[PDB]
Design a protein around this ligand. Structure first.
Ligand SMILES: Cc1ccc(C(=O)Nc2cccc(C(F)(F)F)c2)cc1C(=O)Nc1cnc(Nc2ccc(N3CCN(C)CC3)cc2)nc1
Length: 255
């Protein structure tokens, strides 16, 4: 029988030690730290007054119903200001930064296809739970020390957003699929920004004409055609993540 002013997932702040700022800003910060000394953790702290504690904590509640090996795992929370949200710590950071390290740069197309499927796997779970990511991109993907991936969302722009979402604010798992198509270009180009040298309005005009992003450099034609499916006009025509994972796995087992 815990006290009413504490969450079921509460832990005393004293069990945590914040060691390194991973990122800061708007509604608070993110720190790499330790739980009870031996366990590495990630900690999101709320900037007092930046937003409502309940609003902040709603994210964790959402993560409580979304536990899976391919998604960042919620560890606990501290519900007395400053409010914290604690999750597992992924050693290699964000996929976008990792792909540019001496290691990442050297990853083969086989390894990249692997990771792509992995992400597709996490999205399939998200899909089965009737959830909607809304911001699926390499910046929201975490890499572990064993080079495995996990979907995340750091609460942070056209280039990844599908037309109906941009134009009607209608986000669904289908718009996530479109965003995945784009994420796929980030993977194969080792982190390069999609639509090289194009502004947002340019991208917008191109998409309206029916043009899609130019084949990224060194991109397997088979991979490009899969991306094409993610970018179909009608949301209902884009594939499911299980299908995507299914194909990627085949490309991966053929390399
Ligand atoms: C505290 C927190 C709290 C929540 C989350 C998170 O997803 N939330 C989420 C919310 C809704 C839905 C979902 C989803 F997508 F799962 F469905 C996720 C993430 C964190 C959260 O922030 N977790 C986190 C941060 N960094 C790392 N590792 C990590 C990250 C970056 C870097 N680097 C490399 C070195 N550079 C010097 C700087 C950055 C090094 C390690 N590992 C884990």
């Amino acid at each position: 029988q815990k006290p009413w002013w504490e969450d079921e997932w509460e832990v005393p702040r004293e069990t945590l030690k914040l060691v390194e700022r991973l990122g800061a800003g708007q509604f608070g910060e993110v720190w790499m730290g330790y739980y009870n000394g031996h366990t590495k953790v990630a900690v999101k702290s709320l900037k007092q007054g930046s937003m409502s504690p309940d609003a902040f904590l709603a994210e964790a509640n959402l993560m409580k119903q979304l536990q899976h090996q391919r998604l960042v795992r919620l560890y606990a929370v501290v519900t007395q200001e400053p409010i914290y949200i604690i999750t597992e710590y992924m050693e290699n950071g964000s996929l976008v930064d990792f792909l540019k390290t001496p290691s990442g740069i050297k990853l083969t197309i086989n390894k990249l296809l692997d990771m792509a499927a992995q992400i597709a796997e996490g999205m399939a779970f998200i899909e089965e739970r009737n959830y909607i990511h809304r911001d699926l991109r390499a910046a929201n993907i975490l890499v572990s020390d064993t080079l495995s991936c996990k979907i995340a969302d750091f609460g942070l722009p056209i280039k990844w957003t599908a037309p109906e979402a941009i134009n009607y604010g209608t986000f669904t798992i289908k718009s996530d699929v479109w965003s995945f198509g784009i994420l796929l270009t980030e993977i194969v180009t080792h982190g390069r920004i999609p639509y090289p040298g194009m502004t947002n309005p340019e991208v917008i005009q191109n998409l309206e004409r029916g043009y899609r992003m130019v084949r990224p450099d060194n991109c397997p034609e088979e991979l490009y055609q899969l991306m094409r499916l993610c970018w179909k006009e009608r949301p209902e025509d884009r594939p499911t993540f299980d299908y995507l994972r299914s194909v990627l796995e085949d490309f991966f087992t053929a390399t």
